[PDB]
Coordinates of C-alpha atoms in Angstrom, one line a residue:
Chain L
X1 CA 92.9 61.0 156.8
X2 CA 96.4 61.8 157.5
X3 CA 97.4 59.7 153.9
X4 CA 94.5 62.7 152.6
X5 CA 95.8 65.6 154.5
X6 CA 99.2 64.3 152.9
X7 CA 98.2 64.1 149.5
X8 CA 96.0 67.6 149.4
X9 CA 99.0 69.4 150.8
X10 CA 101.0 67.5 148.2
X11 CA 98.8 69.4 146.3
X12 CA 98.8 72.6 147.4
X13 CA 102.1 73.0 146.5
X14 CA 101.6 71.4 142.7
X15 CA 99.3 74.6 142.5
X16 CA 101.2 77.0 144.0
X17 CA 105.1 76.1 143.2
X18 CA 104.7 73.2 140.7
X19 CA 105.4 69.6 140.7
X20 CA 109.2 70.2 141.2
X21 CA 108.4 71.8 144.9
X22 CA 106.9 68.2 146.2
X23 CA 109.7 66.6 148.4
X24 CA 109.1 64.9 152.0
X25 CA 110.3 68.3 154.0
X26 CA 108.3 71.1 152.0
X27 CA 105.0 68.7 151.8
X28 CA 105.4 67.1 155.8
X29 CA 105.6 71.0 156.1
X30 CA 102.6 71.7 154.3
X31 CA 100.4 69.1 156.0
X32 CA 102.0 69.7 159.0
X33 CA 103.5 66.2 160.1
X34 CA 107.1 64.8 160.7
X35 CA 109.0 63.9 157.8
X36 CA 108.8 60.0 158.7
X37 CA 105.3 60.2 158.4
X38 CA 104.8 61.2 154.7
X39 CA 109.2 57.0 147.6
X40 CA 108.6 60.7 146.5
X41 CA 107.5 59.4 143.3
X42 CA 104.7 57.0 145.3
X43 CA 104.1 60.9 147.0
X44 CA 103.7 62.6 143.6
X45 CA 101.8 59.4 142.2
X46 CA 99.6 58.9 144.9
X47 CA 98.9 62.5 144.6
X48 CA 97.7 62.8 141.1
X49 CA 95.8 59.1 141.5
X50 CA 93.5 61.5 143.6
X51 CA 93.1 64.6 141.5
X52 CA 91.9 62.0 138.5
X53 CA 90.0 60.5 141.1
X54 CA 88.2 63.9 141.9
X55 CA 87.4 65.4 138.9
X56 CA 86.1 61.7 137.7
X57 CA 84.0 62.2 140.8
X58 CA 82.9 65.9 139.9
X59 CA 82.0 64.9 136.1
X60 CA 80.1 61.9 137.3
X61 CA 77.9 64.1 139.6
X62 CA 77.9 66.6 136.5
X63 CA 76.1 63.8 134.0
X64 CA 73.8 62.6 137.1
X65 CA 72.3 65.9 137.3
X66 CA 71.6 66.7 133.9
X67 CA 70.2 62.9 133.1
X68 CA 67.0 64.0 133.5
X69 CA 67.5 66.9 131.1
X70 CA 68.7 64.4 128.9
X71 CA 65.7 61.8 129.2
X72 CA 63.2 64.6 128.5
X73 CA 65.4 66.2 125.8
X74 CA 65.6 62.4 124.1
X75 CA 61.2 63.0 124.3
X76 CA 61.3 66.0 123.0
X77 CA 63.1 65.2 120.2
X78 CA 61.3 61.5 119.6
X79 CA 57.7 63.7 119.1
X80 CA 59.1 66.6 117.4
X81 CA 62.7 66.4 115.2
X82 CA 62.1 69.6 114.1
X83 CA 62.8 70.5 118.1
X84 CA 66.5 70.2 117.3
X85 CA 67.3 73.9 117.0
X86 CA 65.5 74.1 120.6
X87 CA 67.2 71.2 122.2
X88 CA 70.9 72.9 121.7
X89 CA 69.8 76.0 122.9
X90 CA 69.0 74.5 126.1
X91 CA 72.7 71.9 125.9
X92 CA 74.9 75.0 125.3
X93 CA 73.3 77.3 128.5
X94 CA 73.7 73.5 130.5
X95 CA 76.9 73.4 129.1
X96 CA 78.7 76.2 130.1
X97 CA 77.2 76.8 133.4
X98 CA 79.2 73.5 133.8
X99 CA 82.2 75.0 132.5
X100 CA 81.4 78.2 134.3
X101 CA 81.1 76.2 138.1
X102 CA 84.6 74.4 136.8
X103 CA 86.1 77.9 136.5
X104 CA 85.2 79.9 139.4
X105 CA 84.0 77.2 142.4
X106 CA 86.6 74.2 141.4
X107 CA 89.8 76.8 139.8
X108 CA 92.4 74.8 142.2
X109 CA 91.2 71.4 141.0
X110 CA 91.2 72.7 137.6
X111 CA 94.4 73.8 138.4
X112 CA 95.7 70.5 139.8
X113 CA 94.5 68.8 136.7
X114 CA 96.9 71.1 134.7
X115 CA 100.0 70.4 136.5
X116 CA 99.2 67.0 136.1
X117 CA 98.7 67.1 132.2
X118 CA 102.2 68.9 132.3
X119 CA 103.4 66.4 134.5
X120 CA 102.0 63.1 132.5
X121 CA 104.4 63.7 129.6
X122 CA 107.8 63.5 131.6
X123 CA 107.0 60.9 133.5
X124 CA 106.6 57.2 132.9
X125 CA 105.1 56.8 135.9
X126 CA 102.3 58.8 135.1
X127 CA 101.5 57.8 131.6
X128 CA 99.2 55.0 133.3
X129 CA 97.0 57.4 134.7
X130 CA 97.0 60.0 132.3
X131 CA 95.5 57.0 129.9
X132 CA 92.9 56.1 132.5
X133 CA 92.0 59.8 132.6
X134 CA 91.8 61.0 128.7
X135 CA 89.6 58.0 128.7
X136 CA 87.4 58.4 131.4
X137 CA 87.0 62.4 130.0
X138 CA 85.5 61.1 126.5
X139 CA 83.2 58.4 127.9
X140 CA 80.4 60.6 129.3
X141 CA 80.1 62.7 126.3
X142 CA 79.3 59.2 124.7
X143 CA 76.3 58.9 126.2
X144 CA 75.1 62.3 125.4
X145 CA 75.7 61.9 121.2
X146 CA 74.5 58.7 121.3
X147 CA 71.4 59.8 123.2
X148 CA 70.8 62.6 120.8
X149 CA 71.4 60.3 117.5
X150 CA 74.9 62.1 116.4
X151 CA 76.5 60.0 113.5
X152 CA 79.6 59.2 115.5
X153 CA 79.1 59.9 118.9
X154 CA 82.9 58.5 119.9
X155 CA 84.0 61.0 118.0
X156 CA 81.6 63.9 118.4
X157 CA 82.8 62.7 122.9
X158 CA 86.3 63.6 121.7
X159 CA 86.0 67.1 119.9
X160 CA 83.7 68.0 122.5
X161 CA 86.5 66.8 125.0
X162 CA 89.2 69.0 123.1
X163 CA 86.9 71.9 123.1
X164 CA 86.3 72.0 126.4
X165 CA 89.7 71.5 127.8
X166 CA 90.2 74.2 126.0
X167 CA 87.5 76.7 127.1
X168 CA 88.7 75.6 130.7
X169 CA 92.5 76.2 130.1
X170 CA 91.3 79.9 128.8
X171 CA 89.3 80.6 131.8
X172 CA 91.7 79.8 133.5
X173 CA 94.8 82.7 132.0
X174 CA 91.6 85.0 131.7
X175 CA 90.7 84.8 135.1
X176 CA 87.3 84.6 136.9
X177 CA 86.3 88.2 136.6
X178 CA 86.7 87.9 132.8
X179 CA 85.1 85.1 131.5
X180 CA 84.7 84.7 128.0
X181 CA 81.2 83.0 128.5
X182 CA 79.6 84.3 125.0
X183 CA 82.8 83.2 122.9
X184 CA 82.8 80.2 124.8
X185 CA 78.4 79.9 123.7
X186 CA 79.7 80.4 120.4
X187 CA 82.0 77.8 120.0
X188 CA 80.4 75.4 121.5
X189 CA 77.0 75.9 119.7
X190 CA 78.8 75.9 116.4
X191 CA 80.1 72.2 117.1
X192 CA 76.6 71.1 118.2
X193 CA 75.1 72.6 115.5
X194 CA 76.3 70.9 112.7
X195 CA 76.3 67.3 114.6
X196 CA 72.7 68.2 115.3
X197 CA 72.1 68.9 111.3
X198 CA 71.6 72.8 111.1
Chain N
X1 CA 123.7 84.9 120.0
X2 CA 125.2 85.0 123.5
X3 CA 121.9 86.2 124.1
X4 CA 120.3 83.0 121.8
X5 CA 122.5 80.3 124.0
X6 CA 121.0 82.0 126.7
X7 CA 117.6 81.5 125.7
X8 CA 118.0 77.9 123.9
X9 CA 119.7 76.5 127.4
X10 CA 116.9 78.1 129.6
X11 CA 114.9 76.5 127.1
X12 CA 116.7 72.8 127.5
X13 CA 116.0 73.2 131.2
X14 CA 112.2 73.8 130.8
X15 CA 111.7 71.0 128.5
X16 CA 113.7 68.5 130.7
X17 CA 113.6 69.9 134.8
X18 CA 110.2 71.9 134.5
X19 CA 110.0 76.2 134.7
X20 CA 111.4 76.1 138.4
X21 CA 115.1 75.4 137.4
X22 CA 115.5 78.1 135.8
X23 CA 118.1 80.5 137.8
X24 CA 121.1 81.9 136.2
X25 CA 123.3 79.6 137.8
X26 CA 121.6 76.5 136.5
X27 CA 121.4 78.3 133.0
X28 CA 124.9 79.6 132.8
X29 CA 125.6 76.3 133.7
X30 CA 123.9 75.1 130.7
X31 CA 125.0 77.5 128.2
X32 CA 128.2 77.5 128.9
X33 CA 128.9 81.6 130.1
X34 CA 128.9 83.2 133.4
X35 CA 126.5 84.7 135.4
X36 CA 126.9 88.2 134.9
X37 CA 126.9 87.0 131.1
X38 CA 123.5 85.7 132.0
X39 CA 115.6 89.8 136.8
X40 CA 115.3 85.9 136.6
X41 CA 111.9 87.0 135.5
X42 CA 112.8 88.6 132.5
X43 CA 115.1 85.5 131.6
X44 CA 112.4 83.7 131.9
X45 CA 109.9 85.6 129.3
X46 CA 112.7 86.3 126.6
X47 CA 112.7 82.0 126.8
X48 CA 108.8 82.0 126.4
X49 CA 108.7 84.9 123.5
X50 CA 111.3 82.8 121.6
X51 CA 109.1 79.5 122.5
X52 CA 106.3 81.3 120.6
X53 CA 108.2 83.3 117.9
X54 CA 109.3 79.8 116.4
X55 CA 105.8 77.8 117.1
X56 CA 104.5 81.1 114.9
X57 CA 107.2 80.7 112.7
X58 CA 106.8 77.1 112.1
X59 CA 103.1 77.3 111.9
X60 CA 103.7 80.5 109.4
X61 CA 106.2 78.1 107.3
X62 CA 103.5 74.9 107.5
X63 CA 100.6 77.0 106.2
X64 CA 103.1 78.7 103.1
X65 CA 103.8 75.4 102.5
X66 CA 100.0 74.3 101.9
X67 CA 99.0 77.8 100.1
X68 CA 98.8 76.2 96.7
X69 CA 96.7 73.2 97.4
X70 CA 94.6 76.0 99.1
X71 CA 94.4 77.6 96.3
X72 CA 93.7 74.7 94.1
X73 CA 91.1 72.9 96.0
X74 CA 89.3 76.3 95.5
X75 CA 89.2 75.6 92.0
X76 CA 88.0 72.7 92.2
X77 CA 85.2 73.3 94.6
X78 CA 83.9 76.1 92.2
X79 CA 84.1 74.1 89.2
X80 CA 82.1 71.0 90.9
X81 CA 80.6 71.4 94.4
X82 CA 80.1 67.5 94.4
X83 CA 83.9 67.0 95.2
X84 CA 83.8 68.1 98.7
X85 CA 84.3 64.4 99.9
X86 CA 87.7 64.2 97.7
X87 CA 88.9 67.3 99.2
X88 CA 88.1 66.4 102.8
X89 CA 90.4 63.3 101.8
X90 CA 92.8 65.6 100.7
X91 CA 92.8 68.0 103.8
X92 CA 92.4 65.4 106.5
X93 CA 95.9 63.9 104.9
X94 CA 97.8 67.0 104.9
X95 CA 96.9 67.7 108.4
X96 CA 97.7 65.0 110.2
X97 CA 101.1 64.5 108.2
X98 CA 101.4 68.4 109.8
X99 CA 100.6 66.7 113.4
X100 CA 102.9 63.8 112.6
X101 CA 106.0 66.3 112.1
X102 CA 105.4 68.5 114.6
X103 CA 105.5 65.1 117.6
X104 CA 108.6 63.5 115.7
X105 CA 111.0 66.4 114.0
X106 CA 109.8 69.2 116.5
X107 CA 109.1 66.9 120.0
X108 CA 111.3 69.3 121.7
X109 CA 109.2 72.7 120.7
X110 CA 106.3 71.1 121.1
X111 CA 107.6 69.8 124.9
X112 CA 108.9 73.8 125.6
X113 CA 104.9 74.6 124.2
X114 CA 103.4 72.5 126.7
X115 CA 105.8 74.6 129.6
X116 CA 104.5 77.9 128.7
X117 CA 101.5 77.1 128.6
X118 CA 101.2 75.1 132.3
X119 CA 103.8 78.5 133.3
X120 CA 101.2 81.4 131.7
X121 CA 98.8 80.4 134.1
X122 CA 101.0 81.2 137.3
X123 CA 102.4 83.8 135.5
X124 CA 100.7 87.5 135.0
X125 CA 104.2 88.9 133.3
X126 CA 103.2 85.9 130.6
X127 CA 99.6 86.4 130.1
X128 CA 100.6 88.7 127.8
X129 CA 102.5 86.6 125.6
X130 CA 100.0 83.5 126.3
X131 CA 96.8 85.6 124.4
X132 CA 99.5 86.8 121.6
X133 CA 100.0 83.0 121.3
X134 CA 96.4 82.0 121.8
X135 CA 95.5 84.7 118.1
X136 CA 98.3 83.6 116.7
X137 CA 97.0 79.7 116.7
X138 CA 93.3 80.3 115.7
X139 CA 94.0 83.0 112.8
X140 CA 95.7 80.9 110.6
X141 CA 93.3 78.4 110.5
X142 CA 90.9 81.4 109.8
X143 CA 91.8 81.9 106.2
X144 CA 91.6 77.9 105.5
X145 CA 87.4 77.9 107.1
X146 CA 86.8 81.1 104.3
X147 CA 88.8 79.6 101.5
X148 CA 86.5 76.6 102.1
X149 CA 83.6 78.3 102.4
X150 CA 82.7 77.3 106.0
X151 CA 79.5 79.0 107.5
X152 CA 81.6 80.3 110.6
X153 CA 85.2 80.7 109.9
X154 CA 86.3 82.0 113.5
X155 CA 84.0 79.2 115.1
X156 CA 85.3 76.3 113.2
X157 CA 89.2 77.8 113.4
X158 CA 88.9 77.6 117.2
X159 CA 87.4 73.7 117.2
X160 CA 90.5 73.4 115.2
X161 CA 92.6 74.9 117.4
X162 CA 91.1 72.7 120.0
X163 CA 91.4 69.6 118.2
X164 CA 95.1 69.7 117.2
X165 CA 96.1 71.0 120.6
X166 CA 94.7 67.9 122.2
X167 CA 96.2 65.5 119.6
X168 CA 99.3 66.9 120.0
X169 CA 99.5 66.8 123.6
X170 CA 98.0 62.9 123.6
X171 CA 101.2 62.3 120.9
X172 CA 103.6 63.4 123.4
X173 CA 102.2 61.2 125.9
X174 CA 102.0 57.9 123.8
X175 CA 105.6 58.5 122.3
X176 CA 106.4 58.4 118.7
X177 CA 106.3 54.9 118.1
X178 CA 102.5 54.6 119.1
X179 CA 100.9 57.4 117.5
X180 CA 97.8 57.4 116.8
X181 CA 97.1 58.3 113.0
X182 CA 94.3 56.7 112.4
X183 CA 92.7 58.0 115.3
X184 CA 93.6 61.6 114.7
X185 CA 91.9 61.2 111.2
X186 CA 88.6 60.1 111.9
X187 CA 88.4 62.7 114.9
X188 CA 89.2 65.4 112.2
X189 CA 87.7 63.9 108.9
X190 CA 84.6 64.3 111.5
X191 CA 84.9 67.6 112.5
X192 CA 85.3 68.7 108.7
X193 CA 82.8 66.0 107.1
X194 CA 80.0 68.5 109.0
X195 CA 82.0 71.5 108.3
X196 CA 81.5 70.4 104.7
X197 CA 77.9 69.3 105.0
X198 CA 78.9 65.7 104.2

């Protein structure tokens, strides 16, 4: 709990005056501890080991609550085929409600995850995790192509992925209050569209 | 070009020590002058209007560049509908020999790209600039979707948009020696295949 308190002020500052700001002083400010008791690069390491660790967490709960959606969707569409044009009107609203939480209720760990991105490139250090993570991001949507019978659902996971990092990283300039939410519908539902066949 | 040297070494700085060293020590340091010579603020958006002025630029040149294949896979899509699968062969060629030049000859640009882009969000003086840049991206992309004869032009320029973003940025994290073509290939030939109908 102290290491936590550590590493979330650690972050606190990567939101607020970048990864550059992170040194022993400033952060054993920022959690409020001596010095001795926060190998900055461990610090800074350490630091983004979590925030990967977190939103893996938040997506993981994500996929847990819509498997049931996805179980009676795969029903739906085992009776009826012609239920298609249904099903992704009911994955795009699922969709970016997700997208929409990610936005306004998690901004500073959507933030986080944007220094890091920036981070991951100048860093060796970091490339580890950064692999662990763009991996971990494309593995979920797997699941969901494969269980609605897309032709190549590792690389329907992957545009979906590059959408939606997108949509988030334009939510994020636009700002909670202005939401693109019917663009981001738009785009979405073109791209499952024409994996679903219509 | 005083005011160029300026700009390019406040530039150098983002790319290799991040947005926060950029004070007009530091950067007269860098481009040689003094700092009256060299509002930190302003400094600072001149460097990211510059950033993308040449991304549009380049982009401006690449599509120029492509214009007459454009043109001619036009013709031959109304003289024989069938050849949609030669022409996605075509297009999926040309665009990631585009990716491949941008993470080898243009690393640099693409690094100061990445800045502005982890900066606009901090940033209000550059969410201007930053929804500039994000029209800019889509628009050309726009007139390839019609000229093909896609059923959402705007829609399918934005999943573009996405994709390539995301390729690039995953190029600057594996390094030039470990690209991966053949990855970036069968994520776009997919994304176009069902633009296509294929």
């Amino acid at each position: 709990q102290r290491r936590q308190a550590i590493l979330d002020a650690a972050m606190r500052l990567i939101v607020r005056d970048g990864v550059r700001a992170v040194r022993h002083r400033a952060v054993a400010a920022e959690a409020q501890v001596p010095l001795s008791a926060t190998d900055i690069d461990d610090l800074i390491t350490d630091t983004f080991a979590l925030f990967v660790e977190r939103n893996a967490e938040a997506l993981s709960a994500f996929w847990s609550s819509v498997e049931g959606d996805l179980q009676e969707m795969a029903a739906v569409l085992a009776d009826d085929p012609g239920a298609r044009g249904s099903l992704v009107e009911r994955i795009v609203e699922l969709a970016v409600q997700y997208v929409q939480v990610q936005l306004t209720e998690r901004r500073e760990h959507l933030l986080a995850e944007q220094a890091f991105r920036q981070e991951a490139l100048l860093n060796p250090r970091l490339r580890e995790l950064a692999d662990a993570h763009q991996r971990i991001l494309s593995l979920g949507a797997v699941h969901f192509f494969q269980v609605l019978g897309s032709g190549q659902p590792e690389q329907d996971a992957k545009v979906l992925t590059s959408i939606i990092l997108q949509m988030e990283y334009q939510g994020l300039v636009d700002g909670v209050e202005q939401l693109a939410v019917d663009e981001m519908r738009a785009i979405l539902r073109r791209y499952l569209n024409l994996v679903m066949g219509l």
